[PDB]
Structure formats: structure tokens, C-alpha cells
Design an enzyme around this catalytic site. Sequence first.
Site, PDB file in Angstrom:
ATOM      1  N   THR B   1       0.848  -1.227   0.000  1.00 39.99           N
ATOM      2  CA  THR B   1       0.000   0.000   0.000  1.00 39.99           C
ATOM      3  C   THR B   1       0.866   1.253   0.000  1.00 39.99           C
ATOM      4  O   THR B   1       1.813   1.363   0.780  1.00 39.99           O
ATOM      5  CB  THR B   1      -0.937   0.050   1.224  1.00 39.99           C
ATOM      6  OG1 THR B   1      -1.827  -1.073   1.195  1.00 39.99           O
ATOM      7  CG2 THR B   1      -1.754   1.350   1.237  1.00 39.99           C
ATOM      8  N   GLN B   2       0.531   2.192  -0.880  1.00 40.03           N
ATOM      9  CA  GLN B   2       1.236   3.464  -0.954  1.00 40.03           C
ATOM     10  C   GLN B   2       0.248   4.593  -1.227  1.00 40.03           C
ATOM     11  O   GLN B   2      -0.968   4.419  -1.135  1.00 40.03           O
ATOM     12  CB  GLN B   2       2.317   3.454  -2.054  1.00 40.03           C
ATOM     13  CG  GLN B   2       2.680   2.101  -2.643  1.00 40.03           C
ATOM     14  CD  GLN B   2       1.776   1.724  -3.798  1.00 40.03           C
ATOM     15  OE1 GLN B   2       0.560   1.621  -3.635  1.00 40.03           O
ATOM     16  NE2 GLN B   2       2.363   1.536  -4.979  1.00 40.03           N
TER      17      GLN B   2
END
Lengths: 231, 233, 240, 211, 222, 244, 195, 235
Positions: B1-2
Site C-alpha cells: 500500500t502506498q
Amino acid sequence: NNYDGDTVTFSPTGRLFQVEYALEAIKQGSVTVGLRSNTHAVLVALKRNADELSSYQKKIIKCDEHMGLSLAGLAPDARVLSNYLRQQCNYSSLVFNRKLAVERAGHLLCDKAQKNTQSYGGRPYGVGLLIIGYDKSGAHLLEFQPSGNVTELYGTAIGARSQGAKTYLERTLDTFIKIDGNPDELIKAGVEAISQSLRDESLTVDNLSIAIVGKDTPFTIYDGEAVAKYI
Amino acid sequence: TQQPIVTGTSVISMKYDNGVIIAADNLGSYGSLLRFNGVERLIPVGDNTVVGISGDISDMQHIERLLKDLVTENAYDNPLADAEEALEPSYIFEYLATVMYQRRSKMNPLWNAIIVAGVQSNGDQFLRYVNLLGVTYSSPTLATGFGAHMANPLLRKVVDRESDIPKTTVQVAEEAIVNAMRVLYYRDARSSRNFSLAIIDKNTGLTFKKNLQVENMKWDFAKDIKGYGTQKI
Amino acid sequence: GYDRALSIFSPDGHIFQVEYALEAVKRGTCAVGVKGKNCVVLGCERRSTLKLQDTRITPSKVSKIDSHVVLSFSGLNADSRILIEKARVEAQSHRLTLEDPVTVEYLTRYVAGVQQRYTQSGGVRPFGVSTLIAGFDPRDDEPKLYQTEPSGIYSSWSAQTIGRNSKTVREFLEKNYDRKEPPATVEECVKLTVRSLLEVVQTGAKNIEITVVKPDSDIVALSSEEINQYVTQIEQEKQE
Amino acid sequence: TTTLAFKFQHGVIAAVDSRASAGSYISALRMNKVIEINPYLLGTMSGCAADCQYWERLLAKECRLYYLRNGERISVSAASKLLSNMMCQYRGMGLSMGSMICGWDKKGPGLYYVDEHGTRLSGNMFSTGSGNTYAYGVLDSNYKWDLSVEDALYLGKRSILAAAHRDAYSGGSVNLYHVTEDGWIYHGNHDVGELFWKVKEEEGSFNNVIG
Amino acid sequence: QFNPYGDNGGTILGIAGEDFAVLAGDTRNITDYSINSRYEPKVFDCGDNIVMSANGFAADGDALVKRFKNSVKWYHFDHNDKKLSINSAARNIQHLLYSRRFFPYYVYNIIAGLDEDGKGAVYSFDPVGSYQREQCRAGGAAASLIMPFLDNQVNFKNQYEPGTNGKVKKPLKYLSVEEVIKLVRDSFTSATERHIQVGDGLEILIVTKDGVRKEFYELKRD
Amino acid sequence: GSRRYDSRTTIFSPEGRLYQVEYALESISHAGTAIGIMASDGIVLAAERKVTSTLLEQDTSTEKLYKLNDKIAVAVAGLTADAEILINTARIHAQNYLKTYNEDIPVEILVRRLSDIKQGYTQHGGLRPFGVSFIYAGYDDRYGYQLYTSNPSGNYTGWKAISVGANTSAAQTLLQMDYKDDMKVDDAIELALKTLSKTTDSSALTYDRLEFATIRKGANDGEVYQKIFKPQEIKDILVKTGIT
Amino acid sequence: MDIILGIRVQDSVILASSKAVTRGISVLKDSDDKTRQLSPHTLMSFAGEAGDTVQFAEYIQANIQLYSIREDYELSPQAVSSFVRQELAKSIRSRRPYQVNVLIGGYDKKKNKPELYQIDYLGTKVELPYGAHGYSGFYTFSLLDHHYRPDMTTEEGLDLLKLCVQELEKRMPMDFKGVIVKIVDKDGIRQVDDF
Amino acid sequence: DRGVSTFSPEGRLFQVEYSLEAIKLGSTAIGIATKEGVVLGVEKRATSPLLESDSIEKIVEIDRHIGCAMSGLTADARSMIEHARTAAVTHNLYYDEDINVESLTQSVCDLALRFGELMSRPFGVALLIAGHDADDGYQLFHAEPSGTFYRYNAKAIGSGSEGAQAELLNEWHSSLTLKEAELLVLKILKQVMEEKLDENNAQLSCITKQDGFKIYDNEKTAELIKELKEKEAAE
Ligand SMILES: *[C@@](C)(CO)[C@](*)(O)[C@H](Cc1ccccc1)NC(=O)[C@H](Cc1ccc(OC)cc1)NC(=O)[C@@H](C)NC(=O)C1=CC2=CCC=CC2=C1C
Ligand SMILES: [Mg+2]
Ligand SMILES: [Mg+2]
């Protein structure tokens, strides 16, 4: 002699005896013929039985809707290699939405067989394969040897007494290549070719096995009364 | 996740009678900052496919390299690499779609929205969308981000359904795309005046136009607007 | 890891390592198993070459696998400990997962499976051990007696012997044991087990071990004096 | 859901409803909440429908393998324990499965309650699901060991009806089973809509409801 | 934070006849309040006289269908070109879905075909694998709008025979394919009116012993 | 490949013997003799150092007798380096048991554990076995005073009196002759030294060629004491028994 | 589960454990035996999170039974209690700890003494004349502090235990459905069928 | 020494060929397929009279519709049977149906060549796999340690195989009944066995569509032996 104990050992003349012994298993196997025109490609295989109570060992295996092969030698090794082809054909479809090229299929078989000829512990494959298919560049026929060598041909044959059928195809080259849009005549030429390798025994209804693939023809296998037409 | 950092906005496209058109501006935004002004977001693959990408630019550059490597790998042991066994738009799309869906399934997505535009071997038009979730769809008109909200309505007035495609010429389709890009410049705060446009035709091949500008803009009426209600001066 | 194939086929179709494991069993001390009508008895030889031994602490030849099953053996002593430990672990594992103690047939099948696994696994040699596994299934009064061997085959026996000079005591059992009417009591069953060992043992002093197993987890080991009384009675009847 | 099962003189009764829910929406009117593991073994279902189907069908695989290896039917005690051990592997992973394993073996009729926590309880009577309290009320006041097969079937049927009426997430139809030493016997699907009006008239119960 | 799931809308409908079966679905694909496509097929011919639709999150639905189609292919390879029965396909799909019990395929799946006695069959699934054979099932966005209508018009629920006054039910006469298609079209026309995610087009796949046939009907585009 | 050079350490002979175990025992038969004698009120451990030198520092030397814990000790016969590997494992095992059950490890359990390790090297791994034979002298509250022996095969047995290493055949005969069940520690000390004095390959038995130890309940009240004899103490007991 | 009590008298150890089992708002069983025999002269009662309790107890039972067969010898109550403590102390730092509190009542045949050990889920061991887990001690320890002598008979131990249960039944909000009482002495383990 | 997966100059795997020699030393097993069912029979061959013969389990159930007989190093068969049973029930789990006899046989034969330097050697046992399915009907297969399997109308394996196979060559025809096949197995077993055939040292079994796989009782076989003796004495 002293250099045939394993696959990892060259002989003094630069030969790999374990690979040559694996090649020998193919010569003991039953005869199978492959040939193609510009529109279709055909496999013809002489099946072998153990005795009169036994069934006739299957020789032809389907890999995809557009590709398949015939075997000669250790049948279990053909099952392993055909399973690998099925997966590779299938990887090409699922990832790239692309039917696997017959030439690329040959390259993958070559590389898989090669790894077994250079490493300690394992063994070479003890089977020869004739791959047919129809892709974006037309009809194709390949010959696979467990040394790793794969060859694209107009026609060929492998197994016991295969030299007779191979000579016939070498004479008939100009004729059968031109059989376009006529599957039955191309099969006739294959049945006539495999007949040159027969001695004593002849082609019966549960003895003969035929497969075909082409332009508007998926890879299909014919056995039993379906091949009585060609006897 | 970013989270996406440097981003590219809308990519718009449509089908016409003999091919497809695709366009996208040349801006790389850093939040509200219009940081980079020379970014190419249309990436040709061969002479029959153009991939248009929006979203994170670092992930775009990664995809750009995957495609460059894909061309290299397809040529390996392939005498028909520039002919029958050349890369098709459908092959390129399915590859990317496979990658996008795998990455989202590892909870480490490529933060992008992609449109693959091209022409197949048989002359058929190809236009399909894919995004960070692995969601795919096809339509006569396709657009990402703001283009979905503002461009599609304009392009669907030209090609509302499949039967309108043979009736649509390249001049009409290009005109509609160029008008849509102007509308986006009026109304998208993360857009630029400078853009690139690509046409893939089944007869004339791939035409790649760079350094295009939005022109014929209407601003004159602004002089008359005064205040926010009651002010006259 | 060490993966070397030690157990392999020979041209004549034999696995020599498995066959040489049977020779280790032939060297081992004699063990015998006899099942009566309502009991099973396990007899074991103790070679008298070893005196000055501490019989309190020396590993006994008969081992309890659970409260209702016992295991004796012939062959390599160290090898037998590994099978016994595995068997004991499986017995508790079966109670824990299925809420029933193992049947004698199941326990035998497990031990035999371990022995078999060591005949076609890389880097290991076969167990030089044959076992006699005896007991009574839970809530059952029918006696059970099984035999295993290095190859991994197992089978049920009315009476059986293994180890050195087992050929002789098997000869004795084959003519003395009647299937239609087996040893009705414990005495008759023990007497027949002692008689069979007296064909081979040498002296009937501390060389014979006897273990009686009865239904419902009733297992006891006879003492020296108790066994000596059987030895006395047998020879006194023989003097005639 | 509402499920129940109880032991008695002539074996064990098993009764379940057939409703399925997705919030306030009734997603299914007629769902099977009993699994026929084998001819002498049953399994009730309560909780996540997916979890119940998958794990009880995996239990049936494992109970079948037991028969092949041992040449003998598995006990109810052992079957329930295999299932409880499956639940202990996925301990705290979020499964939702409440089940009763009903059957007849060598010890006679058997009944075990098993849940997602790995709980395994032996007993004469159990009831699971969102409407189990309503079913327990009828069972406790009318249960005896000396019940006839006819009266016992009616009790389980009437107990589900009680729950189907009051519990919003229970209803549809009633599926009945009777387990004997010759195996289980299916005693049909009974629509609650029709069954309610029938029971009301014949029994005189549900006086407050108008019909 | 990254949300791996989405909602592409749509609605599907499966009805089983006496010797046939239908599987219908709208052709609209959406995100939030936007339309992605007015024609994006959702119901597929998977081979062996089986049709399938996975409605909900399109990415997961396309992956499941793709996997099942693959499962059919390998069933032929491994079992001598044997035909995959509808009941065997249903069980296979349960295991595909439960393989992701802890990261689910966000789809409501339906398949349709014929059973081994030639009768019409519809199987219905939840996102994690629970399945069951059914006569009638609507799935997706407008499932709650349509299902009660089918309970009334297919299984004749709450319908009694006049004159008896609630004493005798309406008998359960089977429906023809022509009568079923009417109920399908009226179901989707009604759903299109009251649900914003439903519209554009309707594609129906009919399954008989003769094979799989398609029928397409336009819907409102607003 | 590598197969060519594999000696195959874990295989049976045609007669059903383990080659490497038998050859390890042959190695041990050349090692210095070690004797253990169990009495009613204690245990004696006596052992002969192999052809020493005058320049060997004896008081700090240890090749035969090792301490496993406060209750258990061992006498070594064979490769000292191999023995130390096993000894350190046994020391750990005893401490693991103490940590787990809060009780000192029973002698047999420790012996079985070491013997199981030796067994493993004969059945799997393709490594040579440990060329070591132990005499275990120990005490616990179950069986009291105990003597055991283990060898490279991994087989262990209990004893009243026993010898390992060189001349065990001769040594065992002498022990079997003079040993009695009602014997005491002071008598057992004398028997051990007399047996070594007759079986030794040396010209004369001296203090500098011996290691000696006792495990006695001869400690203040109900408890056990280990005594590893010092060079001067071995010299005194040699004079006392009348050997030098 | 809810309440488990223990008391060590002159020549025996007495363990009392509640019979109730609850899921949701319903009491599923009122005759549950919250105990396992580890060996002929060692009994362990248990209480904690659902499922974990029985799994842990049966796992301990299997390990002690394995030891008994291997050595043909019964471990002392002290040795068993130490083994159990280590397993819990090992467990508390695991990915998912076993949430189980136990009482171990045993008769040491060597020393001819009864012994009671209290161990919580963290691995906190204490030898006591009387013990309890959870809230049980809050109500009962005042009575035990007052009435307990070390020379008490088994019958006097049961009477003092009845008084403890009566106090629990009066002042606890929860209905635990009475207790199953078991006695551990030189002759082994037996259950008091009327209590 | 030499590799385990080594080819001979003739093109055969040494270890596979040597395992076939071990199978020739095994006790005789015979199978006969008919349109009314498939019959499986074996020689028990007890090494001593004290050995309880009923514990000799050389005929084995794989599923309700598939049975199996073995010959050779019978200890090696246990893991093959375990795999077969698992494969059969696992397919029932995945596909809610019975598994094809051929597919089951193929799954067993896939284990065969999984040996090298996986298990250390090939299996030293041959299997006769008999069963029934809806597609191909009553079937009999012969599974070898080479990984090869042939379908047979009738087949004998073990020590008296070539003599029994020659006898099966003459006797088998496509219109055989189940009763006729039962007597035919008993006849040929009696011919090749060392000891005199009876209900205790020989075992029969069959597989039918209705009743599934059944091992015959010693009382039931005894009557078929008595029926055989009388019909041979009849001419
Ligand atoms: C009571 C109805 C409680 O609500 C029962 O417990 C019932 C048990 C049950 C039903 C069917 C099969 C076996 C057992 N449970 C449910 O209906 C269950 C309730 C529920 C919901 C959510 C959780 O997560 C904590 C647990 C329990 N409902 C479901 O599992 C839902 C998700 N099922 C469906 O929505 C569903 C739709 C559907 C369509 C076609 C075929 C099957 C379908 C299902 C199961
Ligand atoms: Mg609208
Ligand atoms: Mg505490």
C-alpha cells in the site's frame, strides 16, 4: 564404457553415452509418422499391445486446441513433457491472450530436456516426440529428441523401422506438400507412409491411431471405427 | 500500500471508422504544484499500439520499461517478430491487465489507469481500459480521471453506440478529441495546455503528434463579470 | 542433506540391505509369542555371556507401547528404541485425535509402515529389527498377536517366534500348538511358552523372561522364582 | 437460523429451519442446513453458510477415508473430534460455524455439539442459531426419554416452528431427520406458513395470532 | 489507504425450466455515478453446455470465470474428454471460491445448464462458496427488486385459486421458454426504471439440449 | 559426481553387522582401560591414562573422567575429542531436564538420550560414528546407585561391575571372580585398582598413570558427593591398598 | 469457564469446579466436567477462554501419559506442575497464547503428602493450602483464611468447601450451576457424586 | 557405484527392470473382466501353518466402485493404496462424482517414476486395478513400477504369470458370465499354486455396478471350489 555411468560425464571423443542410451529407447518404440501441407498437419501412429487380452497403448496426446504430439519411447516421460507443453500453451493464453507458436513450443521443450543432460543426479528423457500444430504462420511439424535437438520439418518418422517411412516421405515431398484443403488425402499419404515401416503385422481397426490439425480444424484424435475409413 | 506522489491526469480516446485516437497532456503534478512540464504519457509499442497512462509517474516509468522489455523478449528466437508474430494490442493489454490484478492482489498496486489503443492484424480496432484494481472494460470512447466525467459525454455525442463507428471519420474524431482537451484545460486544475496525440489507422499506420497546444480559447466574456452578487464596479 | 540411495534392487530382484537387516535379526536373542484363549504371553531370551549385569536397571526386552499393548523384538537393540519411541508417540497421538486407544492391528500397521519407509528413503538404512506386537483391543476379549520385519510386511499369528534359533522353536510350536483348542488358561499358555524356549535357551535360570498380558490393560511380568517353578515342573515330567 | 437435535429412547431427532439472511434481506427461503455425511451420520449447520458447507463436506471426506483404512464406520465421538480439530487450526482466523454431529454407533445413539472455538460437548439435547432460545423453551418443557418416534418428530418440528415465528432470522421451512440403528431417515420438508396455521387450529396454540 | 475492492454494478438473473435454462444479465459497467461501458458482456458460455456469470466486482468476476473455464479444459485433459456435469461444475466452483476465504472474490455467481436427466438447472453461490441448486435466482444490484417478483410469478407465492378463499393454492405449472423470456424482460425493464446502475442493454443466454443460444434486447440509457 | 567418493558409513554387511560400528569398537579396544564398580554405599570409577610423559602437567589434565552434573559422572574410552562433543550435549540435556521438571535428571534417561544420538549416526546422515565407549556412574532417588555403559552402536546396558577399552576380556574375568553383592566402597576401590594392576600393559601401575573417582553417600547426611581424586590422593590410595 | 476451587487438607487434595457452559445468552450444558486426570495420583482442573481450555488440558494429559509409559513411573505433582508452568510461560509469548488457568491437585506417594499448585495463564506458579482462579477467590478466601487448618480431615474439608460454594451462590451474579467435586489421595482419584 | 536413474545400453532403466524381477517372485494374482463384472483372485501363500491366513490382505478396496489386487513386495503397496484412496475421495470432494477407473490408475502410476537421488527406489510391486464407471463400463488395469499401465480383458501377475496368461488366452471370450469367471480364476490359481487350493490359502473378490466391490467369504469361496471340482469331474 567408463564414461556412461551418469549424464555429467563426457567420453574421450566428446560423446554423452547416457543421452545416446536414452536415444536408443526411442528406436525400440513403435513407429509414428508426421507430415504436413500448407493448410493441414497430420500425425499417424502405430499403436502397440502387450498381448491379445491387452489394449493398444495410446501414442497421441493433445496439448491445446491448435497443437499436439505423438510419442515413441518411455510413455511416462511423454506424459511429463506433454503436461509441460499444456501448461506453457495455457500460460500464453491466460497472460497474453495468445496462442503459443509451434516454433516457441519446440524451443521450450529443447531447454527443458537440456537441463537434464548437464546436471548430476537426474537423467535424460527417454522419449521422442513429433509435434504438429497450426498457428499464425500456418501449419507446422516438429521433431523432438531428448538430447535437446528440435527440428522443423515437412515430414518425418520416428521409432522402430522408421527409416522406411522417412524414405517414402522424402520421395513424396513434392506431392503431399501440395495437398491443400483436402484432409482425407493428406491422411491417406500418412497412412501410406507408415505402411512402409510395417513387417508381418498390418493396419487393423484398433491398431491405427491418427490425428489432424488445420486452418478451420481443431486438434482431434481418431481411433477405433473412426479410422476404418483409411484402412 | 502506498500513495501516489507525482501524478498525470486524464487520458482520453475514441474509435473511428479506420482506427483509434488517443490523447493525454504533458504535465507531471506534485499535488497542487505543477512541477514537471515535459512528461510524455503516451507510449507507443511497435507501429500498431499506443498505451496511454494516468496516475503515478514512477509506476508509469516502471510500466514503460516492462513494455520496452516485452518487445525485446518477443523478438528472441522469432523470425516473424516484424510480421505475423509481432506484438498485438490485445497481447500487450492482457499482459498489463495480468500485472495490475496481480499487484492489487498482493496489496501493492501500480497506482495507474491505463488505456491501450491500437489496431489488430485483421484491421479490427482495439480499445480497452485497465486500472490499479485490475478492472477492465471496453467502449467506443474511453477516458480516465476527469476525462471520464467531461470528455466521454462529448465523445459519446459523436459515437453513442457501436453502429456510429463506421460513420465517423478521422477528421471528425480528431476534432472531437481536440475540443475535449480544451474543455479539460478550462476545468481540470491539474491539467496543462501542452499535450500529445496519437492516431493508429489500419491504412496510414501510426501517426504520433507532439507539442500540441490548446487554442481558440474563450476568455473575453470575463471582462464583464464583476463581483460576486451586488457589486457593479 | 545426505540423500544416497542405500536400499536398491539388484539384478536378481533383491534388496540386499533389507535382506542383510534380516541377518541382524537372526543374530538377535530369541523372542516368542503365544496367544491362549483369554491371554497372550511374550517370552524372551537373555544371553548369559553377560554376567555382573544389574537386572534392575538394564533395559527390559518387552516394552509397553500403551496400557493395553506391548512390544518385544529381536535384532539391534539401539534400533528397537527408535521404533518403540515412535510407536509410543503415535499411541498418544491417536488417543488425542480420535478419542480411542489404538487397536493392536493399527499400531502394528504403523510400526510396519515406519520400517517400510526406511527401505525406500534416501540416506537411511533399514531397521535391523523384527517385532512381536501383542495385546487386547479396547472393550474386546479376543487376543491379538502380530509380527513385523525390516521389509515392512506384517501379519497375525496364533503363535510365532523370531531371533536366533527361531527355526527350532517354530518347529516345536508347529507340532505342539493346536488351533482347535489353544491354551485355555494362563498356566497352560506360560508353560507352553517356557517349554518352547527351553529347546534353545541353555539354562533355565535368569535366561528366560516372561510377560503375561490379559484383557482390560492387565499386564504383569513374572519374576525369576515364578519362572523357575515352570522350569522345574517341565523337566520332572520329562524324566519319564 | 434455528437448529436442534436430541437423543431419546428410539435414537436421535434432528430438526432445522431453512432461512438465509443478508442483513434484513431474506436471501434464501429454502436452504439445506443438514448434511448427510454417511447413512449413520448427520451434521447441522449454523453460522457462515460457506464455512458450514466446506468444513462439513471436508469432514465427510475424512470420515470416508476412515472407513477405507479400518473397514469400519467411524464413531460419532471421533467424527466430532476431527471437526473440532479442524476448527482449532483456523483458531481466531474468523470462522463462524455451529454444528451438531448426530448419529448411531456401537455405543448407541450419539450427539455432539461443536463450534468455531473448538468447543466439543456431549449431551442429550442441543439447539444452535439466532432462535435457539425459543426452541429450548418448548424442548425443556416437553422432552422425555420415553418419547415415541411420532411424538419426538413432532416435538422437534414444533420447536423450530416456535423459533421461526418469533425470531426474524429463522423460518421458511422445517427439515426433519430421525436417526436409527439402521441409519437416518428423512421426514420431509414442511413449509412454516402452512404448518403454522395447521398447528394453530389442531393444537389451539398461538391464540394471540388471528387467523 | 488502498481499497482492493470495487463495485461495477450490474444485475443477473437465472431461471430453470423443465427442459431448458436461462441466464440473463445487463450489459452496463459502472463506477460510482459514471458509466464505463454500455456493452460489456457479463454472462459467458464456459463450455459443456454451461453458462456462468460472476456479478459484483468485475476484476474478481473475470478472474473466477477465467479460472473455471480453465478448470473445464483440464477436466477434459485429465478425464478422457468427459463432459463436466452441472453438479460437478458447481462443486468445483465452491472450491475455487473458498480458496480465497480470507481474501474473497467479491462476486455473486450463478451458473445454468442441464442436469444429467436433461432437466433445467440453476446453481447459485455466495462470495465465499456456499452454493445450492435453485429454480429461480436474481443476483447483483437489483436482486432485492426482482426476487420477490419471481417468487410471485414463477413459484406462484401468495397466489391462491379464486372462490376457495385461501384454502387451495395456485398449482405449480411449469413455464415455457417464451413465457420465461417475458418475465426476464419485464424484470429488467422494471429494474432499469428504479435502479440507477441497471440499464443500457440486456443479454440472455438460453441453454437446451441443442446448445447455447443468445438473445439481445435494448434497455433505457439514462 | 560425488557418489564416487562416498564410503557409505551406515550400511549392513552381508552377515548383518554395521561395518563402521565394528571398526569403531576395534579402535576403542586399544584405548586405556576404564573400570566401574558399583557397591551398596557408593560407586567407584577407575581409569588408566595412556603412555604418559614426565613433562605432562597431570594436576590440570583430564582425559578419562568427566563430570556431567553433581550426581552423574562418566569414564571415557576412545577418541577424547569425540567424547567431549557428547559430554557437552549430555551436560545440556541434564540442565534442560532440571529447568523443565525442577528435578535432577534420572540416570537412565540421560544415558538413553546419549545412546540415541550415537544410534542416529549408524542409521542416517552418512557420517562416521563416535569412536567412544562410556561408563556412566550416577545416583538418583528411584534406583539409587547405577552403572551403565554405551558404545558406538548406541546400545546401552546396566552393570554391577564393568570395564571398557583395552583388555576388557581379562578385566571382566577378574571382576567376576572377586565381586560380591554385599561389597562396600572401600573394598570396591581396592578391587578396581588390583584389576588395573594385573591387566595393564605398563610395567608398573603408578599414580601419574591413573585417574580415579568415587560417588559416595559418604556426605554429611542424606546426600551424594562426587570426588575426583587429585594426583597426591591417588598416590596415597595406591600405598594404602598395597600396590606401590 | 467460570469457577474452580482447590483445598489441600491433611491427607488429600479436593478440587471443586463449576458445571455450566454458556454460548451467547444460552446455557448449553449444566453437567460439564472441567478436569482431566494427568496420572493416577494427579488431577488438573481448568478455566479460561472457550476451546483453549480443553485443548490445553488434553495436550498436557497426553504428554504426562507419554512420560508414564516411557519410564514406567509416575511423575511427582511438583514435576508435573513445573512442566505445565513452562508450557504456559512458553505460550504467553506465542503468536496466539492459550488463555487457560489451572489448578493441579496431586498426592505425592514418595513423601506421602497432598499438594496443590495454582498456575495462571501467564505461567505464574504458587504452592498453596487452598486456591482459586478469577473472581472466585474474592468471595471464598475470607472463609478459608478463617476456617482452614492443616490437620483437617477430608470430611471437614468438604464441609468448608460447601460453605464456600454457598457464599458464591449467594453473592455472585452469575449462575454457575453447582460444582463437581473430586478428591485426590493415596488411593487415587474419586468423584463425590452427591454435593 | 552407479546412478539409480541410469539407462542401460539397450535403453531401459536398470532399477525398473530389476523391480520387475522382484514381482516375478511374488504370489500369483489374477483378474478377469466381463460384462457382468470384474473378478479378482489371489494366492495367499502363508509361510507357516501358525500364521492366521485371514490376516493376509492382498486384495484391497480403493473405493466402492474400484478394487485392487497386488503381487510382489506387498509392503510397498500400502503407500500406493493410501494415495489411491486419497485420490478417489478427493476427486469426489472436488467434483461430486465417482472417479474414472483409468484416471485413478493414472494417478497411481504417476508415483512410479518419482525416484532418484522423492523416494530412493521404484516400487517392488505390481497392481491389478479393477472397477466400474458409467463412461467405459467394467475395466481391468495392470499398473507396473515403470509408470506404464495397460488395460486387459484378463491378466495374471506373479510367479505363475506366463503359464496362467497362456491359459487365460484360450479361455477368455466376450460373453463370459460372472459365475463362469469366478470358476475360471479358481481353476487357473489351482493350476499354478504349489500347495493345494482351498478357501484358506486363496481369496476371491469382485466388482459389480449394483453391489460395488466385495471380498468373498471363505464359506462362499468354498462352495465355488466344490462346484469347480464337480464340473471338472463331469467330463
Ligand atoms: C440463520 C439464518 C442466522 O442468520 C442461520 O444461521 C443461517 C445458517 C445457514 C444458512 C444456509 C446454509 C447453512 C447454514 N445463516 C445464514 O443465513 C448466514 C448468517 C450469517 C451472515 C454473516 C455471517 O458472518 C459473520 C454469519 C452468518 N448468512 C450467510 O451466510 C449469508 C452470507 N449467505 C448468503 O447471503 C447467501 C446468499 C446466497 C445465495 C445463493 C446461495 C446461497 C446464499 C447464501 C448462503
Ligand atoms: Mg442518467
Ligand atoms: Mg496464579
